[PDB]
Coordinates of C-alpha atoms and ligand atoms in Angstrom, one line a residue:
Chain A
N27 CA 0.2 0.1 -0.2
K28 CA 1.2 3.4 -0.6
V29 CA 2.0 6.0 1.9
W30 CA 1.3 9.4 1.3
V31 CA 3.5 12.2 3.0
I32 CA 2.5 16.1 2.9
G33 CA 4.4 18.7 4.2
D34 CA 8.1 20.3 4.7
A35 CA 10.9 20.0 2.9
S36 CA 14.0 22.0 3.6
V37 CA 17.8 22.3 3.2
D38 CA 19.2 21.8 6.5
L39 CA 22.5 23.5 7.0
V40 CA 24.5 21.9 9.7
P41 CA 27.6 23.8 10.9
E42 CA 30.5 21.3 10.4
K43 CA 33.1 23.5 11.6
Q44 CA 32.9 27.0 13.1
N45 CA 33.4 28.5 9.4
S46 CA 31.8 26.1 7.3
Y47 CA 28.2 24.8 6.7
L48 CA 27.1 21.4 5.7
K49 CA 24.5 20.8 2.9
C50 CA 21.9 18.3 3.8
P51 CA 18.5 17.5 2.7
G52 CA 15.8 18.1 5.7
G53 CA 12.4 18.6 6.7
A54 CA 10.0 16.6 8.6
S55 CA 7.9 15.2 5.9
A56 CA 10.9 14.9 3.6
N57 CA 13.0 12.7 5.9
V58 CA 9.6 10.5 6.6
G59 CA 9.2 10.1 2.9
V60 CA 13.0 9.2 2.0
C61 CA 12.8 7.0 5.4
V62 CA 10.1 4.8 3.9
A63 CA 11.0 4.9 0.3
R64 CA 14.7 3.4 1.6
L65 CA 13.1 0.9 3.3
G66 CA 11.6 -0.4 -0.1
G67 CA 8.0 1.1 1.0
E68 CA 6.2 2.7 -1.6
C69 CA 5.9 6.5 -0.7
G70 CA 4.8 9.7 -2.6
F71 CA 5.4 13.3 -1.5
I72 CA 2.6 15.4 -1.5
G73 CA 3.7 19.4 -1.1
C74 CA 5.1 22.7 -2.8
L75 CA 8.9 24.0 -3.5
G76 CA 10.7 26.8 -5.2
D77 CA 11.8 26.4 -8.6
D78 CA 15.1 27.4 -6.9
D79 CA 18.3 25.4 -6.3
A80 CA 16.9 24.0 -3.0
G81 CA 14.2 23.1 -4.8
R82 CA 15.2 21.3 -7.7
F83 CA 18.2 19.9 -5.7
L84 CA 15.6 18.3 -2.9
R85 CA 13.4 17.1 -5.6
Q86 CA 16.2 15.6 -7.1
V87 CA 17.1 13.9 -3.6
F88 CA 13.6 12.6 -3.8
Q89 CA 14.0 10.9 -6.9
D90 CA 17.5 9.4 -5.7
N91 CA 15.8 7.8 -3.1
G92 CA 13.0 6.6 -4.8
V93 CA 10.5 8.7 -3.4
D94 CA 7.3 9.7 -6.2
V95 CA 7.4 13.2 -6.6
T96 CA 4.4 13.4 -9.0
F97 CA 2.4 15.4 -6.8
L98 CA 5.3 17.7 -5.7
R99 CA 5.0 21.2 -7.2
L100 CA 8.0 23.5 -7.9
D101 CA 7.1 27.6 -8.1
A102 CA 9.7 29.6 -9.5
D103 CA 7.9 32.4 -7.9
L104 CA 8.2 30.5 -4.1
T105 CA 11.5 30.2 -2.4
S106 CA 12.2 26.4 -0.8
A107 CA 13.1 26.5 3.0
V108 CA 16.1 26.5 4.0
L109 CA 17.5 26.3 7.8
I110 CA 20.1 26.5 10.0
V111 CA 20.4 23.7 12.4
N112 CA 21.8 24.2 16.0
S113 CA 17.6 24.8 18.0
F114 CA 16.2 25.6 14.6
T115 CA 17.0 29.2 13.4
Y116 CA 14.4 29.3 10.1
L117 CA 16.1 31.6 7.3
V118 CA 13.2 31.4 5.1
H119 CA 10.5 33.0 6.4
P120 CA 7.0 32.0 4.6
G121 CA 8.7 28.8 2.9
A122 CA 7.4 27.5 -0.3
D123 CA 6.1 24.5 1.5
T124 CA 3.6 26.5 3.2
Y125 CA 1.4 26.9 -0.1
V126 CA 0.3 23.5 -0.9
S127 CA -3.4 23.6 -1.2
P128 CA -6.5 20.9 -1.4
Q129 CA -5.7 20.8 -5.1
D130 CA -2.5 19.4 -5.1
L131 CA -3.9 16.6 -3.2
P132 CA -3.7 13.0 -5.5
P133 CA -6.7 10.7 -5.5
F134 CA -6.5 8.6 -2.7
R135 CA -7.3 4.8 -2.4
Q136 CA -8.6 2.2 0.2
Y137 CA -5.9 1.4 2.6
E138 CA -3.1 3.6 1.5
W139 CA -1.7 5.9 4.5
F140 CA -1.5 9.7 4.6
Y141 CA 0.8 11.8 6.9
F142 CA 1.3 14.8 8.0
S143 CA 2.4 17.0 11.3
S144 CA 2.0 20.3 13.4
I145 CA 4.3 22.0 11.1
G146 CA 2.4 21.1 7.7
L147 CA -0.4 23.2 9.7
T148 CA 1.4 26.2 10.6
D149 CA 0.6 28.5 7.5
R150 CA -2.5 29.1 5.6
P151 CA -2.7 26.8 2.4
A152 CA -0.7 24.0 3.6
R153 CA -2.8 23.7 6.8
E154 CA -6.2 23.1 4.3
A155 CA -4.2 20.7 2.2
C156 CA -3.4 18.8 5.4
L157 CA -6.7 18.6 6.8
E158 CA -8.6 18.4 3.9
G159 CA -6.0 15.6 2.6
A160 CA -6.8 13.6 6.0
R161 CA -10.3 13.7 5.8
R162 CA -10.3 12.6 2.1
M163 CA -8.2 9.8 3.2
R164 CA -9.9 8.8 5.7
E165 CA -13.5 8.7 3.5
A166 CA -11.6 6.6 0.7
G167 CA -10.9 4.0 3.3
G168 CA -7.4 4.6 4.2
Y169 CA -5.5 5.6 7.3
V170 CA -3.8 8.6 8.7
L171 CA -1.1 8.7 11.1
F172 CA -0.5 12.1 12.7
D173 CA 2.5 13.2 14.2
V174 CA 2.5 16.1 16.4
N175 CA 5.5 17.7 15.7
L176 CA 5.7 21.0 17.8
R177 CA 7.5 23.7 16.5
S178 CA 5.6 26.5 18.0
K179 CA 8.6 29.0 17.7
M180 CA 7.5 29.2 14.0
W181 CA 3.7 29.6 14.7
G182 CA 2.3 32.9 14.3
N183 CA -0.4 32.5 17.1
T184 CA 0.3 29.8 20.0
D185 CA -3.6 30.1 20.3
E186 CA -4.4 27.9 17.5
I187 CA -1.9 25.2 18.0
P188 CA -4.2 22.8 20.5
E189 CA -7.7 23.4 18.2
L190 CA -5.7 22.2 15.2
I191 CA -4.1 19.4 17.3
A192 CA -7.2 18.8 18.4
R193 CA -9.2 18.2 14.9
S194 CA -6.2 16.5 13.9
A195 CA -6.3 14.0 16.3
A196 CA -10.3 13.5 15.4
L197 CA -8.9 12.8 11.9
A198 CA -6.1 10.7 12.7
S199 CA -6.2 6.7 12.8
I200 CA -2.8 6.6 14.7
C201 CA -1.5 9.9 16.8
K202 CA 2.5 9.6 17.2
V203 CA 4.0 12.3 20.0
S204 CA 6.8 12.9 22.1
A205 CA 7.0 12.9 26.0
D206 CA 8.4 16.3 25.5
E207 CA 5.7 17.6 23.2
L208 CA 2.7 16.0 25.5
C209 CA 3.7 18.2 28.4
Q210 CA 4.2 21.6 26.6
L211 CA 0.7 21.0 25.1
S212 CA -1.5 20.8 28.0
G213 CA 0.9 22.3 30.6
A214 CA 2.3 19.2 32.1
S215 CA 5.4 18.4 33.9
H216 CA 5.5 14.8 33.8
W217 CA 4.0 13.2 30.5
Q218 CA 2.4 10.4 32.0
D219 CA -0.2 12.6 33.8
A220 CA -1.2 13.8 30.4
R221 CA -0.4 10.4 28.2
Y222 CA -4.0 10.3 27.4
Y223 CA -4.1 13.9 26.1
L224 CA -4.6 12.8 22.3
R225 CA -6.8 10.1 23.3
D226 CA -9.3 11.9 25.2
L227 CA -9.1 14.0 22.1
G228 CA -10.5 11.7 19.8
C229 CA -7.5 9.4 18.9
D230 CA -8.2 5.8 20.0
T231 CA -4.2 5.1 19.5
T232 CA -1.7 6.8 20.2
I233 CA 2.5 6.2 20.2
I234 CA 4.3 8.4 22.6
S235 CA 8.4 8.2 21.7
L236 CA 11.0 8.5 24.8
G237 CA 14.4 9.5 24.5
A238 CA 16.3 6.4 24.1
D239 CA 14.2 4.6 25.8
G240 CA 11.6 3.4 22.7
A241 CA 8.0 4.2 22.8
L242 CA 4.9 3.7 24.3
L243 CA 1.7 2.0 22.9
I244 CA -1.6 3.0 24.1
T245 CA -4.3 1.2 22.7
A246 CA -7.5 -0.5 24.6
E247 CA -5.8 -3.8 25.4
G248 CA -3.3 -1.7 27.5
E249 CA 0.2 0.4 27.3
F250 CA 2.9 -1.4 25.9
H251 CA 6.7 -0.8 26.1
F252 CA 9.3 -0.8 23.3
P253 CA 13.1 -0.3 24.6
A254 CA 14.9 1.8 22.1
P255 CA 18.4 0.4 20.8
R256 CA 21.6 1.5 22.3
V257 CA 22.3 4.3 20.4
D258 CA 25.9 6.5 20.1
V259 CA 24.2 10.4 19.7
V260 CA 26.1 12.0 16.8
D261 CA 23.2 14.7 15.9
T262 CA 19.6 13.6 17.0
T263 CA 18.2 15.8 14.2
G264 CA 15.8 13.4 12.3
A265 CA 15.3 10.7 15.0
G266 CA 11.7 11.4 15.3
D267 CA 10.8 11.7 11.6
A268 CA 13.1 8.2 11.1
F269 CA 10.8 6.7 14.0
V270 CA 7.7 7.7 12.0
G271 CA 9.2 6.4 8.9
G272 CA 9.8 2.8 10.0
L273 CA 6.5 3.2 11.6
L274 CA 4.8 3.8 8.2
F275 CA 6.8 1.3 6.5
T276 CA 5.6 -1.2 8.3
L277 CA 2.2 -0.6 8.4
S278 CA 1.7 -0.4 4.9
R279 CA 3.1 -3.6 4.4
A280 CA -0.6 -5.0 4.9
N281 CA -4.1 -3.6 5.2
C282 CA -5.6 -3.8 8.3
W283 CA -3.3 -3.0 11.4
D284 CA -3.5 -4.4 15.2
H285 CA -1.7 -4.6 18.5
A286 CA 0.6 -7.5 16.9
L287 CA 1.1 -5.5 13.9
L288 CA 1.5 -2.4 15.7
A289 CA 4.4 -3.7 17.9
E290 CA 6.2 -4.9 14.9
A291 CA 5.8 -1.4 13.8
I292 CA 7.0 -0.2 16.8
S293 CA 10.1 -2.4 17.0
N294 CA 11.0 -1.1 13.6
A295 CA 10.3 2.7 14.4
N296 CA 12.9 2.5 17.4
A297 CA 15.3 0.7 15.6
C298 CA 15.1 3.5 12.7
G299 CA 14.8 6.4 15.3
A300 CA 18.2 4.9 17.0
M301 CA 19.9 4.6 13.7
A302 CA 19.2 7.8 12.4
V303 CA 20.9 9.7 14.9
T304 CA 24.5 8.0 14.3
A305 CA 25.2 10.8 11.5
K306 CA 25.2 14.3 10.6
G307 CA 22.0 15.0 8.5
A308 CA 18.1 14.2 9.3
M309 CA 18.5 11.5 6.5
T310 CA 22.2 10.6 6.0
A311 CA 22.0 7.4 8.3
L312 CA 18.6 6.4 6.9
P313 CA 19.0 2.7 6.8
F314 CA 18.0 0.4 3.5
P315 CA 16.7 -3.3 4.3
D316 CA 20.4 -4.6 3.7
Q317 CA 21.0 -2.5 6.8
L318 CA 18.1 -2.6 8.8
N319 CA 18.6 -5.9 10.1
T320 CA 22.5 -6.0 10.4
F321 CA 21.4 -3.5 13.1
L322 CA 18.0 -5.1 14.1
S323 CA 19.6 -8.2 15.2
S324 CA 23.1 -6.3 16.1
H325 CA 21.1 -4.9 18.9
Chain B
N2 CA 40.3 59.7 15.2
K3 CA 37.5 56.8 14.8
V4 CA 35.9 55.9 11.8
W5 CA 32.2 54.8 12.5
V6 CA 30.8 52.3 10.2
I7 CA 27.2 51.4 9.7
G8 CA 25.2 49.2 7.5
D9 CA 25.2 45.7 6.6
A10 CA 26.9 42.7 7.8
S11 CA 25.8 39.4 6.5
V12 CA 27.3 35.9 5.8
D13 CA 27.5 34.6 2.3
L14 CA 27.7 30.9 1.7
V15 CA 29.7 29.7 -1.2
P16 CA 30.0 26.0 -2.6
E17 CA 33.0 23.5 -2.6
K18 CA 32.8 19.7 -2.5
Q19 CA 29.4 18.1 -3.6
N20 CA 27.6 19.1 -0.5
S21 CA 29.1 21.9 1.5
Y22 CA 28.9 25.5 1.8
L23 CA 31.6 28.0 3.0
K24 CA 30.8 31.0 5.4
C25 CA 32.1 34.0 3.9
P26 CA 32.3 37.3 5.8
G27 CA 30.3 40.2 3.6
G28 CA 28.4 43.1 3.6
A29 CA 29.4 46.7 2.3
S30 CA 29.8 48.2 5.4
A31 CA 31.2 45.1 7.2
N32 CA 34.1 44.9 4.5
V33 CA 34.7 48.7 4.9
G34 CA 35.0 48.6 8.7
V35 CA 37.3 45.4 8.2
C36 CA 39.5 47.5 5.6
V37 CA 40.3 49.9 7.8
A38 CA 41.0 48.2 10.9
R39 CA 42.9 45.6 8.8
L40 CA 45.1 48.5 8.3
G41 CA 45.6 49.7 11.6
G42 CA 43.0 52.4 11.9
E43 CA 40.4 52.7 14.6
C44 CA 37.2 51.5 13.4
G45 CA 33.8 51.0 15.2
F46 CA 30.9 49.0 13.6
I47 CA 27.3 50.0 13.8
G48 CA 24.3 47.7 13.3
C49 CA 22.1 45.2 14.0
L50 CA 22.7 40.9 13.2
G51 CA 21.0 38.1 14.6
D52 CA 21.4 35.6 17.4
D53 CA 21.9 32.9 15.3
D54 CA 25.2 30.6 14.2
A55 CA 25.5 33.3 11.7
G56 CA 25.6 36.4 13.2
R57 CA 28.1 35.2 15.8
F58 CA 30.1 34.0 13.3
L59 CA 30.2 37.7 11.6
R60 CA 30.8 39.1 14.9
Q61 CA 33.7 37.2 15.7
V62 CA 35.3 37.9 12.4
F63 CA 34.7 41.7 13.2
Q64 CA 36.6 41.0 16.7
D65 CA 39.3 39.1 14.8
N66 CA 40.3 42.0 12.6
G67 CA 39.9 44.5 15.2
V68 CA 36.8 46.0 14.5
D69 CA 35.1 47.5 17.8
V70 CA 31.6 45.6 18.0
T71 CA 30.3 47.7 21.0
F72 CA 27.6 48.8 19.2
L73 CA 27.1 45.5 17.3
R74 CA 23.7 44.8 18.8
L75 CA 23.0 41.0 18.7
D76 CA 19.4 39.7 18.7
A77 CA 17.3 36.9 19.4
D78 CA 14.3 38.1 17.7
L79 CA 16.0 39.1 14.3
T80 CA 17.6 36.6 11.7
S81 CA 21.4 37.3 10.3
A82 CA 21.2 37.9 6.5
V83 CA 22.9 34.7 4.8
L84 CA 23.0 34.3 1.0
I85 CA 23.9 31.3 -1.1
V86 CA 25.8 32.3 -4.0
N87 CA 25.2 29.7 -7.2
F88 CA 23.8 35.8 -4.8
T89 CA 20.6 34.5 -3.7
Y90 CA 18.7 35.8 -0.4
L91 CA 16.6 33.7 1.9
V92 CA 16.1 36.2 4.9
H93 CA 14.1 39.1 3.7
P94 CA 12.5 40.7 6.8
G95 CA 16.1 41.9 7.0
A96 CA 18.0 41.9 10.2
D97 CA 20.6 44.4 10.0
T98 CA 17.7 46.5 8.8
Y99 CA 16.6 46.6 12.3
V100 CA 19.3 49.2 13.5
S101 CA 17.5 52.1 14.8
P102 CA 19.0 55.7 16.0
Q103 CA 18.9 54.5 19.8
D104 CA 22.0 52.3 18.5
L105 CA 24.0 55.2 17.7
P106 CA 27.1 55.7 20.1
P107 CA 28.0 59.6 20.8
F108 CA 29.8 61.3 18.6
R109 CA 33.1 63.3 18.7
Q110 CA 34.3 65.6 16.5
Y111 CA 36.9 65.0 13.5
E112 CA 35.2 61.3 13.6
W113 CA 34.1 60.1 10.7
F114 CA 30.8 58.1 9.9
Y115 CA 30.1 56.2 6.9
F116 CA 27.0 54.5 5.3
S117 CA 25.6 53.8 1.6
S118 CA 22.5 53.6 -0.3
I119 CA 22.5 49.8 1.1
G120 CA 21.8 50.9 4.5
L121 CA 19.1 53.2 3.2
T122 CA 17.0 50.4 1.6
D123 CA 14.9 49.4 4.2
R124 CA 12.7 52.0 6.8
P125 CA 13.8 50.4 10.1
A126 CA 17.1 51.5 9.8
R127 CA 17.6 54.4 6.9
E128 CA 16.8 56.5 9.7
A129 CA 19.8 55.3 11.7
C130 CA 21.9 56.3 8.8
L131 CA 20.5 59.7 8.4
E132 CA 20.5 60.4 12.0
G133 CA 23.8 59.4 12.4
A134 CA 24.9 61.5 9.5
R135 CA 23.3 64.5 11.1
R136 CA 24.7 63.8 14.4
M137 CA 27.9 63.3 13.2
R138 CA 27.9 66.6 11.3
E139 CA 26.9 68.2 14.6
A140 CA 29.6 66.7 16.6
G141 CA 32.2 68.3 14.2
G142 CA 32.5 64.9 12.8
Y143 CA 32.8 64.3 8.8
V144 CA 30.4 62.1 6.9
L145 CA 31.2 59.8 3.9
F146 CA 28.8 58.5 1.8
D147 CA 29.0 55.7 -0.5
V148 CA 26.2 55.8 -3.3
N149 CA 26.3 52.1 -3.5
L150 CA 23.6 51.1 -6.0
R151 CA 21.9 48.0 -5.5
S152 CA 18.1 48.8 -7.4
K153 CA 17.5 45.1 -7.1
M154 CA 16.9 45.5 -3.3
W155 CA 15.1 48.4 -3.4
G156 CA 11.0 47.9 -3.9
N157 CA 10.2 51.2 -4.7
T158 CA 13.1 52.5 -7.0
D159 CA 11.2 56.0 -6.8
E160 CA 12.6 56.5 -3.4
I161 CA 16.2 56.2 -4.8
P162 CA 17.0 59.9 -5.9
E163 CA 15.9 61.8 -2.7
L164 CA 17.3 59.7 -0.3
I165 CA 20.9 60.0 -2.3
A166 CA 20.0 63.7 -2.7
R167 CA 19.3 64.0 1.2
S168 CA 22.6 62.2 1.9
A169 CA 24.6 64.2 -0.5
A170 CA 23.4 67.1 1.7
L171 CA 24.6 65.8 4.8
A172 CA 27.9 64.0 3.5
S173 CA 31.0 65.9 3.4
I174 CA 32.8 63.5 0.9
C175 CA 30.6 61.5 -1.7
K176 CA 32.0 58.3 -3.4
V177 CA 30.3 56.9 -6.3
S178 CA 31.3 55.0 -9.4
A179 CA 31.1 55.9 -12.9
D180 CA 28.4 53.5 -13.8
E181 CA 26.5 54.7 -11.0
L182 CA 26.5 58.0 -12.2
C183 CA 24.5 56.6 -15.1
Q184 CA 22.3 54.8 -13.2
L185 CA 21.1 58.1 -11.5
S186 CA 21.6 60.7 -14.3
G187 CA 21.1 58.3 -17.3
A188 CA 23.6 59.8 -19.1
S189 CA 25.5 57.0 -21.4
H190 CA 29.0 58.8 -20.5
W191 CA 29.5 59.3 -17.0
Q192 CA 32.0 62.5 -17.7
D193 CA 28.3 64.4 -18.3
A194 CA 27.4 63.4 -14.4
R195 CA 30.5 64.3 -12.9
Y196 CA 29.0 67.3 -11.3
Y197 CA 25.6 65.1 -10.2
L198 CA 26.3 65.0 -6.7
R199 CA 28.1 68.8 -6.7
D200 CA 24.6 69.9 -7.5
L201 CA 23.0 68.1 -4.8
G202 CA 25.1 69.8 -2.0
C203 CA 28.3 67.5 -2.0
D204 CA 31.4 70.0 -2.0
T205 CA 33.8 67.0 -2.9
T206 CA 33.1 64.1 -4.7
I207 CA 35.2 61.0 -5.2
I208 CA 34.5 58.8 -8.3
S209 CA 35.5 55.2 -8.6
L210 CA 36.4 54.2 -12.2
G211 CA 38.2 51.1 -11.5
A212 CA 41.3 50.2 -13.6
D213 CA 41.3 53.9 -14.5
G214 CA 41.8 55.0 -10.9
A215 CA 39.8 57.9 -9.6
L216 CA 38.4 61.5 -10.4
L217 CA 38.3 64.0 -7.6
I218 CA 35.8 66.4 -8.1
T219 CA 36.2 69.5 -5.7
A220 CA 35.2 73.2 -6.1
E221 CA 38.7 74.5 -7.4
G222 CA 39.1 71.9 -10.4
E223 CA 39.1 68.0 -11.1
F224 CA 41.9 66.0 -10.4
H225 CA 42.5 62.3 -11.9
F226 CA 44.1 59.7 -10.2
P227 CA 45.1 56.6 -12.1
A228 CA 45.2 53.1 -10.7
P229 CA 48.2 50.8 -10.4
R230 CA 48.0 48.3 -13.6
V231 CA 46.9 44.7 -12.5
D232 CA 45.7 41.4 -12.8
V233 CA 42.3 42.4 -12.7
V234 CA 41.0 38.7 -11.6
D235 CA 37.6 39.3 -9.6
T236 CA 36.4 42.9 -8.8
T237 CA 34.4 41.8 -6.2
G238 CA 35.0 43.9 -2.6
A239 CA 36.8 46.2 -4.8
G240 CA 34.7 49.3 -4.0
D241 CA 34.3 48.5 -0.1
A242 CA 38.1 48.0 -0.3
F243 CA 38.3 51.6 -2.2
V244 CA 36.4 53.2 0.6
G245 CA 38.3 51.3 3.3
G246 CA 41.4 52.6 2.5
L247 CA 40.0 56.1 1.8
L248 CA 38.5 56.8 5.2
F249 CA 41.6 55.0 6.9
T250 CA 43.8 57.6 5.3
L251 CA 41.4 60.4 6.2
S252 CA 41.0 59.5 10.1
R253 CA 44.9 59.9 10.1
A254 CA 44.6 63.9 10.5
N255 CA 42.0 66.1 12.4
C256 CA 41.0 68.5 9.0
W257 CA 41.9 67.1 5.8
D258 CA 43.4 69.3 3.4
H259 CA 44.7 68.8 -0.3
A260 CA 47.7 66.6 0.8
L261 CA 45.5 64.3 2.8
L262 CA 43.0 63.9 0.2
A263 CA 45.7 63.5 -2.4
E264 CA 47.3 60.6 -0.8
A265 CA 43.9 58.8 0.4
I266 CA 42.5 58.5 -3.0
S267 CA 46.2 56.9 -4.0
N268 CA 45.6 54.6 -1.0
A269 CA 42.0 53.8 -2.1
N270 CA 42.8 52.7 -5.6
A271 CA 45.8 50.3 -4.2
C272 CA 43.4 48.9 -2.0
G273 CA 40.7 48.6 -4.5
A274 CA 43.0 47.0 -6.7
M275 CA 44.5 44.3 -4.5
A276 CA 40.9 43.8 -4.0
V277 CA 40.8 42.7 -7.6
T278 CA 43.9 40.8 -8.3
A279 CA 42.3 38.2 -5.7
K280 CA 39.5 35.9 -5.4
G281 CA 36.6 36.0 -2.8
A282 CA 36.0 39.5 -1.4
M283 CA 37.0 40.5 2.1
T284 CA 39.7 37.6 1.2
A285 CA 41.3 40.3 -0.7
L286 CA 41.6 42.8 1.8
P287 CA 45.4 43.6 2.5
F288 CA 47.2 44.0 5.8
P289 CA 49.6 47.0 6.3
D290 CA 52.5 45.2 5.0
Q291 CA 51.6 43.9 2.3
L292 CA 49.9 47.2 0.8
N293 CA 53.6 48.6 1.2
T294 CA 55.2 45.8 -0.6
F295 CA 52.4 46.1 -3.2
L296 CA 53.0 49.9 -3.7
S297 CA 56.3 49.8 -3.6
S298 CA 56.3 47.0 -6.6
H299 CA 54.3 49.0 -9.0
Ligands
LIG420 N1 11.7 21.6 8.1 C1 11.6 22.0 9.3 C2 10.9 23.0 9.8 N2 11.1 23.3 11.1 C3 11.7 22.0 11.6 N3 11.9 21.4 10.1 C4 12.6 19.7 10.4 O1 12.2 19.3 11.5 C5 13.2 18.0 10.9 C6 13.4 16.8 12.3 O2 12.1 16.5 12.6 C7 14.4 18.6 10.5 O3 14.8 17.9 9.3 C8 14.1 20.1 10.3 O4 14.7 20.3 8.8
LIG421 K1 -9.0 9.5 15.5
LIG422 K1 21.3 12.7 12.3
LIG423 K1 26.6 68.2 2.2
LIG424 K1 37.7 40.3 -5.7

């Protein structure tokens, strides 16, 4: 089954040595898509980019990794998001990614998967492309994986975040969130005190990522833990997106998901999340099957 | 005497290995300041920068070169200008465009104040430049207005002439390129416009001419200064270099006269040249040793 990813695809600049930046493909949605694609999964990226260097550059990268770019529009009037990794400094302000709209959306088939995060909900057009998209995919008989990726910083009014999150989860089939983002959401301090924020918000199934700990599968049969492999932190940047990638790659393998499948999925997610931090770039270390298992077992 | 430089400072990313860029110090005012400093002149940079990896990078460079950064206010709500040469821009609400009159230090007599058209583009800082020029003049200071044309950066090309005009009014000395004398008047031959600024209120104008040296225009006549014959590799940062060597020389006295003027332009041409023979930009700005090794070699 195809996994549709919609959202941001930037050009992350990672300080190599204090007088020289490193150029590596970036963006939540992008990363997630390249991840799923690298694992041989069938993934299509939906979104907007500038017909500029970063744009074509990023578009090429998508192709090099096997991601379908049939629905990736490049606009020689917009400026593809560039950023400086540190914390995240967002050079390009509006960002061509925010211009996606309901029309850039493709026909969804039954059982396919739709992905998006808080990021894509930030600005005008894109926000409607995400919610309209989610709704359509559900009507088509597909699934939606909403990953609350909280980058509040780049939001105009932090007043909207809860509402979008809320109706976002209503639309979701599965919600992914970090321990960290939970607290920040409903003014918590310890996440457990709010590890139902999403469930009590319409999402019957929520996955909570936890440092190098692993995750937490919350379905009605109960809470389940999956330990994360012993990592060696080089650049955390991209762990979460890698986590979602390995997660969607696993679910697309079938037509209906259950605890059984969710666990195999989460196991895969944790693995990918671990790996992706062993390099210097959101997607540099995203595994290929030949590499996924050399690690799986090896841990 | 101290030379105050106010304006743009941004980082320029230049390609290299397949997947990597190189942080290059850039910006008219920046270069000019680094120039005057890297020549043993006392120079202070006035302006705004983002508190990002970039801003600090630039700020350090300023310190590495001996430029006073006491009035280089760093900020966490602004975004340091960065460009990727393939000369592309990614930061538009600006950053160094936020400097205001409240960021100007106290001026002392005989001190020099510098700025260009660039610093006059966005209205959050255009006031810092004009307010600054005015104060420096009141303090018994001097003003060097360098019309640094860049109609690309301007949204309303209708403002340009007015600001320029008001700039010459405040300035003591105006620096312009032949090419610029044409964009302003239109004349296809700059010799036609050599009195452009003079009519706008500037008693003395210094016209950059590249390989052809400079042409000084003062009330008592015009005096041509030819430039040392050289490679002519990459002409980038040349003008900013020219201004630097120019301000470095004038700051050497308290009241500039005929001789200081004559020498200053000689110095300017020299610096402008060295800028050319080499690639990059600020990576062509000479040190007090090679300037001599150079002069005493042509
Ligand atoms: N594109 C973007 C905007 N704000 C953050 N991001 C992306 O988030 C990803 C990690 O989840 C990074 O690759 C970063 O570029
Ligand atoms: K739901
Ligand atoms: K990484
Ligand atoms: K004047
Ligand atoms: K040069």
